[PDB]
Symmetry: C2
Subunit: 83 residues, 2 copies
């Protein structure tokens, strides 16, 4: 039953984080009572990797801190050319 | 902008409550421009016949396509579970 809350809350965190151009994809997997989550964010292609890495880490930390029932969280980045 | 939250919740709920579904294994939503593409995988009895699991997956797909706004492509896969 927790998948619905996990996915909404995690998506809402990611979508409004600094440097996120938009969410690319979100995946939730039930493992017993736990939800494993993978999220991939679109980020400016020309950002430095140190900066994109900080963004991914901050999103991960915040989802882990704030979202109940999520066990593992992975946050990946997809570059996008910004018009 | 985004319709992802409604798509995921409504689709998960359709799949979870369908006949022969032991539970949802995973769900994935992808934003493609203004569209959402969805993949869902359901746990089913390991001993269900292929013909039966194909009917279940197709019915879930049809119902999500019919009921869930803003979803474009829908794929429904199955994962077998043998309890005993």
């Amino acid at each position: 039953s927790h998948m619905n809350d996990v996915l909404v809350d995690a998506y809402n965190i990611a979508k409004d984080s600094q440097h996120v151009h938009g969410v690319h994809y979100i995946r939730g997997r039930n493992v017993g009572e736990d939800v494993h989550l993978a999220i991939n964010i679109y980020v400016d292609a020309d950002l430095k990797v140190f900066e994109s890495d900080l963004v991914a880490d901050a999103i991960r930390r915040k989802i882990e801190a704030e979202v109940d029932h999520v066990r593992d969280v992975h946050v990946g980045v997809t570059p996008v050319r910004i018009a």
